Design a protein around this motif. Structure first.
Motif, mmCIF file in Angstrom:
data_model
loop_
_atom_site.group_PDB
_atom_site.id
_atom_site.type_symbol
_atom_site.label_atom_id
_atom_site.label_comp_id
_atom_site.label_asym_id
_atom_site.label_seq_id
_atom_site.Cartn_x
_atom_site.Cartn_y
_atom_site.Cartn_z
ATOM 1 N N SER A 364 0.787 -1.219 0.000
ATOM 2 C CA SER A 364 0.000 0.000 0.000
ATOM 3 C C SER A 364 0.828 1.283 0.000
ATOM 4 C CB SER A 364 -0.964 -0.006 1.188
ATOM 5 O OG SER A 364 -0.274 -0.158 2.408
ATOM 6 N N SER A 367 -1.962 8.436 -0.124
ATOM 7 C CA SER A 367 -2.398 9.303 -1.212
ATOM 8 C C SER A 367 -3.289 10.392 -0.636
ATOM 9 C CB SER A 367 -3.156 8.515 -2.284
ATOM 10 O OG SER A 367 -3.375 9.305 -3.449
ATOM 11 N N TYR A 379 -4.943 9.353 3.077
ATOM 12 C CA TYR A 379 -5.544 8.046 3.331
ATOM 13 C C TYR A 379 -4.680 6.957 2.709
ATOM 14 C CZ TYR A 379 -6.976 7.986 -1.519
ATOM 15 O OH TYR A 379 -6.935 7.959 -2.889
ATOM 16 N N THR A 381 -4.184 3.707 0.362
ATOM 17 C CA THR A 381 -4.774 3.041 -0.796
ATOM 18 C C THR A 381 -3.775 2.005 -1.320
ATOM 19 O OG1 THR A 381 -5.807 3.400 -2.992
ATOM 20 C CG2 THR A 381 -3.828 4.692 -2.488
ATOM 21 N N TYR A 411 -9.778 -0.311 3.403
ATOM 22 C CA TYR A 411 -9.687 0.666 2.331
ATOM 23 C C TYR A 411 -10.998 1.395 2.032
ATOM 24 C CZ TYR A 411 -5.181 -1.588 1.491
ATOM 25 O OH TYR A 411 -3.897 -2.071 1.617
ATOM 26 N N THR A 414 -10.879 4.680 -0.145
ATOM 27 C CA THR A 414 -10.461 4.585 -1.537
ATOM 28 C C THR A 414 -11.595 4.644 -2.543
ATOM 29 O OG1 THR A 414 -10.498 2.162 -1.813
ATOM 30 C CG2 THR A 414 -8.581 3.126 -0.761
ATOM 31 N N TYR A 473 -9.612 12.742 -6.231
ATOM 32 C CA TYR A 473 -8.456 11.929 -5.900
ATOM 33 C C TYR A 473 -7.295 12.373 -6.788
ATOM 34 C CZ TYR A 473 -11.718 8.810 -3.395
ATOM 35 O OH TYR A 473 -12.619 8.191 -2.558
ATOM 36 N N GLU A 477 -3.505 8.357 -8.480
ATOM 37 C CA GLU A 477 -4.458 7.346 -8.036
ATOM 38 C C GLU A 477 -5.476 7.058 -9.130
ATOM 39 O OE1 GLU A 477 -4.349 5.381 -5.778
ATOM 40 O OE2 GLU A 477 -6.332 4.585 -5.373
#
Ligand code: 1O3
Ligand code: MG
Length: 559
Positions: A364, A367, A379, A381, A411, A414, A473, A477
């Motif tokens: 992981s 991001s 967080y 992701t 997650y 995400t 986002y 990502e």
């Protein structure tokens, strides 16, 4: 010595093994390229064996010994308690591999006369016999992946159920408290995803000019030496222990942890192990300690400045003070050599990173997105490929563990878990009328039983309300998800939004917890947003035991 020796007998399956994703009406709406999804089997066992079999090279130095003493000093403050047979039994998962001595998980959990008596005999035997290598079973693990531009199955080694309950009795408390007392903020399993991000971000911001990297040890378990395992026991022995626990630990170390005979599913002698077994209680704790020890020492040898480690078993990420591009690249190469001498050679060569979002650890990375207020929010992701392939597989077949439920929990913030996982699984649970039914999933290796209808609360407590309003986002990502959807054949955003709005409506009409799921989980799907206020049940959750330690391979169940 050789990490493994082989007799020639094959690693055999204990039943038929599925390799391809079945053409299922429900899994096809999630992922179309079903031929890209596969599950490993024993048929690839030989390829794995060749990669994990080799002679280890290990040279210890003053840096290693100094760090070992620092770790023992902290371990010296710990007092391990020793579990009763009742407590240990209660920690056994319902679907744990049955004992070859006339009893299984159910009996163990029910404290049946035959289960308890045999467990007592295995324990007394650990107090009396300090040498006889304990028998282990070796199997090819069945895991799901997506073909790449195929992975051979992993090998799991575990002792009998009786021995497993004894491990708990003697070491459960130790592997649950010592890692933290020894490594402090560096022990990664004490953090929830939100907290892990917080730790990575604050550590990153504490540097004048940050530099970080992930270190991938080539097949870590096989690089662990007899010396490493004894050093690991030397750390446990610093604890204040009951005499029986102290002897149990001593015996388990020499008879199980440092190695032992390998038996296949057919009862045939396969060979011998002289490295870390993946399926014993100390595997997670042991690997974290060993990786941290070798790494902290490697940093001193490499002259890296201000090193901050974050270790989760064999997974390592280091954040330090940069000394310039050229020097960082040199210090890193020096680090790798120190690690190589300590018997922790790299698989993927390590590369220095100056952008946090580009550092992958525990598969992981951190991001950034934005909440309703427009404030930046960090967080955790990860690439969705595997989670999705597995979600497809778990949709076409029944599985003891639901990785999809675990991926949703960890997650939740995400873009992929919200748009795809939540929509897909909630719509399926509705159609089958099973929103009430509790399902099992794993968090840091421990098994948990969770009610889908509690997801809103769980997500709020773990990630905060922002998890229900994130938007915008990062381009990075967004691209990763996009290309993933193209590769796997996953429907576009527009399709998921339509399904989401439909699932949302059907959920709201039901009222109760279902309506709460509809309001929070799917607020991203509608234009006319709803006010998302703190869920009452959220402030009344005992989610502490969820992030205390790692237990992968530990045969652990938390009720
Ligand atoms: O907020 C965003 O960054 C965003 C990213 C997109 O990029 C994607 C491209 C391909 C596949 C999926 C998303 C598409 C729409 C976006 N905005 S959105 O529709 O309000 C939205 C959709 C889903 C979630 Br949950 C959160 C959102 F806010
Ligand atoms: Mg590795």
């Amino acid at each position: 010595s050789m990490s493994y020796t082989w007799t020639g007998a094959l690693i055999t399956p204990c039943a038929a093994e599925e390799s391809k994703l079945p053409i299922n009406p429900l899994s096809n709406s999630l992922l179309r390229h079903h031929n890209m999804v596969y599950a490993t089997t024993s048929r690839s066992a030989s390829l794995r064996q060749k990669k994990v079999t080799f002679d280890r090279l290990q040279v210890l130095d003053d840096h290693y010994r100094d760090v070992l003493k620092e770790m023992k000093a902290k371990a010296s403050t710990v007092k391990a308690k020793l579990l009763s047979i009742e407590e240990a039994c209660k920690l056994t998962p319902p679907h744990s591999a049955k004992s070859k001595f006339g009893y299984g998980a159910k009996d163990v959990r029910n404290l049946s006369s035959r289960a308890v008596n045999h467990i007592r005999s295995v324990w007394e035997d650990l107090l009396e016999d300090t040498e006889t290598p304990i028998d282990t079973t070796i199997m090819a693990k069945s895991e799901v992946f997506c073909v790449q531009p195929r992975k051979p199955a992993r090998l799991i080694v575990f002792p009998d159920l009786g021995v497993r309950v004894c491990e708990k009795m003697a070491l459960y408390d130790v592997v649950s408290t010592l890692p933290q007392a020894v490594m402090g903020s560096s022990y990664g399993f004490q953090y929830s995803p939100k907290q892990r991000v917080e730790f990575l971000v604050n550590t990153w911001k504490s540097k004048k000019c940050p530099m970080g990297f992930s270190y991938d040890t080539r097949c870590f378990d096989s690089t662990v030496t007899e010396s490493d395992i004894r050093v690991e026991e030397s750390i446990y022995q610093c604890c204040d222990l009951a005499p029986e626990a102290r002897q149990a630990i001593r015996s388990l170390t020499e008879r199980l942890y440092i190695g032992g005979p390998l038996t296949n599913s057919k009862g045939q002698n396969c060979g011998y192990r002289r490295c870390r077994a993946s399926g014993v209680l100390t595997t997670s704790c042991g690997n974290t300690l060993t990786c941290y020890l070798k790494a902290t020492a490697a940093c001193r040898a490499a002259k890296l400045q201000d090193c901050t480690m974050l270790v989760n078993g064999d997974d390592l990420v280091v954040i330090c003070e940069s000394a310039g591009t050229q020097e960082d690249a040199a210090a890193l190469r020096a680090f790798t050599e120190a690690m190589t001498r300590y018997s922790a050679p790299p698989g993927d060569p390590p590369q220095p990173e100056y952008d946090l979002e580009l550092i992958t650890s525990c598969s992981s990375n951190v991001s950034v997105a934005h909440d309703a207020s427009g404030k930046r929010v960090y967080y955790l992701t990860r690439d969705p490929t595997t989670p999705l392939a597995r979600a497809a597989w778990e949709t076409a077949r029944h599985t003891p563990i639901n990785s999809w439920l675990g991926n949703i929990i960890m997650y939740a913030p995400t873009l992929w878990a919200r748009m795809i996982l939540m929509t897909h699984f909630f719509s399926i649970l509705l159609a089958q009328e099973q929103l009430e039914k509790a399902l099992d999933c794993q968090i840091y290796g421990a098994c948990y039983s969770i009610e889908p209808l509690d997801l809103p609360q769980i997500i709020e407590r773990l990630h905060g309300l922002s998890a229900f309003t994130l938007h915008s986002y990062s381009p990075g990502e967004i691209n990763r998800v996009a290309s993933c959807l193209r590769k796997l054949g996953v429907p576009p955003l527009r399709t998921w939004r339509h399904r989401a709005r439909s699932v949302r409506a059907k959920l709201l009409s039901q009222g109760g917890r279902a309506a709460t799921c509809g309001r929070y989980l799917f607020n991203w799907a509608v234009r006319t947003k709803l006010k998302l206020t703190p869920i009452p049940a959220a402030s009344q959750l005992d989610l502490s035991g969820w992030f205390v330690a790692g237990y992968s391979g530990g045969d652990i169940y938390h009720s």
